[PDB]
């Protein structure tokens, strides 16, 4: 089923024709847009006060990567390399080494944001929820070398950003 959109032949009645003539001579439909625009002017603007005020978000938001750690303190990553194998832009580079004890995690864990896509695929690919997409959209910088993190800062990012994601995965662990 379809609905015809544009054909309505105007009536040639004296009342109807003087309507179009009045509309033409006296700008009436033209002032209709002018007039409503006045009504919309008096509406209070829907502008937030950045950075004093920030827009709504959701627990399942993708931001900067942050390598988390267990409540004891041991970092969750166990070098399964699934995040590297899934990363659609190969932003992850992984090297591993059994060091001394129950802490062989990474020789190298470099996430390349200017290469990364922020798809979040690494987050649900991780079997231990080690690498996560943090809730911080605010990690801009001035140098290109800044926009890549080493393994250490991922740990520092997970250390610095810890309360937010711990509660975020707390609320979202059943959805995914």
């Amino acid at each position: 089923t379809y609905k015809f959109v544009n054909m309505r032949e105007p009536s040639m009645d004296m009342k109807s024709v003087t309507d179009r003539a009045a509309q033409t001579l006296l700008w009436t439909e033209l002032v209709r847009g002018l007039g409503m625009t006045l009504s919309y002017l008096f509406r209070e603007p829907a502008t937030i006060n950045y950075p004093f005020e920030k827009g709504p978000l959701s627990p399942r938001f993708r931001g900067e990567h942050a390598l988390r750690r267990y409540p004891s303190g041991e970092e969750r990553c166990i070098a399964c390399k699934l995040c590297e194998a899934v990363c659609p832009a190969q932003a992850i580079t992984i090297e591993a080494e059994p060091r001394a004890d129950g802490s062989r995690r990474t020789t190298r864990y470099d996430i390349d944001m200017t290469k990364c896509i922020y798809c979040g695929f690494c987050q649900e690919a991780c079997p231990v929820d080690a690498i996560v997409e943090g809730p911080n959209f605010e990690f801009s910088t001035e140098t290109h070398e800044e926009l890549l993190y080493n393994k250490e800062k991922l740990l520092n990012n997970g250390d610095k950003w810890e309360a937010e994601i711990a509660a975020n995965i707390q609320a979202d662990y059943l959805y995914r």
């Binding site: 829907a46 937030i48 006060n49 950045y50 950075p51 004093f52 005020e53 920030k54 827009g55 709504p56 978000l57 959701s58 627990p59 938001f61 750690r69 409540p71 303190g73 090297e95 990474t106 020789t107 190298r108 864990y109 470099d110 809730p135 911080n136 605010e138 990690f139 801009s140 910088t141 001035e142 140098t143 070398e145 800044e146 890549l148 993190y149 080493n150 393994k151 250490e152 800062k153 250390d159 610095k160 950003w161 810890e162 309360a163 937010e164 711990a166 509660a167 975020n168 609320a171």
Partner: protein, 145 residues
């Protein structure tokens, strides 16, 4: 009657914002004169407000502190002084302040939340996190045999 009602709302606005000095402070720095309930106050001096009566996205807002880690910010500000516990509340990822239920405190979390250190000497630098892979054969210390 409603006209003078909004006039006294402005008269309430100047009075409630710490008199004239506070109102001129927020007008020239906070860029807004709205008054909200004191929802919380973190350890960094950042003053937070909540006004559920306002339309969505303008219910919860933040007045930033004048000092953070020796980075005087009375005039200039940015969206990164917010500590991790409150950063989810500001972005309304949740309808609970950290004061009502604090996050699970553990040993390794930072005690002083930091901001973008870009430009400052505290900025990050990329570096190799791996050891040397091909170490060279050290020349013998002894002279000609």
């Amino acid at each position: 009657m409603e006209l003078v009602q909004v006039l006294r709302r402005g008269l309430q606005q100047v009075s409630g914002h710490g008199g004239l000095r506070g109102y001129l402070r927020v007008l020239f720095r906070a860029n807004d004169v709205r008054v909200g309930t004191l929802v919380g106050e973190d350890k960094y001096g950042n003053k937070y407000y909540e006004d559920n009566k306002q339309f969505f996205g303008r219910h919860r807002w933040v007045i930033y502190t004048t000092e953070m880690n020796g980075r005087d910010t009375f005039w200039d500000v940015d969206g990164s002084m917010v500590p991790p516990e409150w950063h989810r509340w500001l972005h309304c990822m949740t309808d609970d302040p950290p004061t009502t239920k604090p996050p699970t405190a553990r040993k390794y979390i930072w005690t002083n939340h930091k901001f973008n250190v870009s430009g400052t000497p505290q900025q990050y630098v990329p570096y190799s996190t791996t050891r040397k892979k091909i170490q060279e054969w050290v020349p013998p210390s002894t002279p000609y045999k």
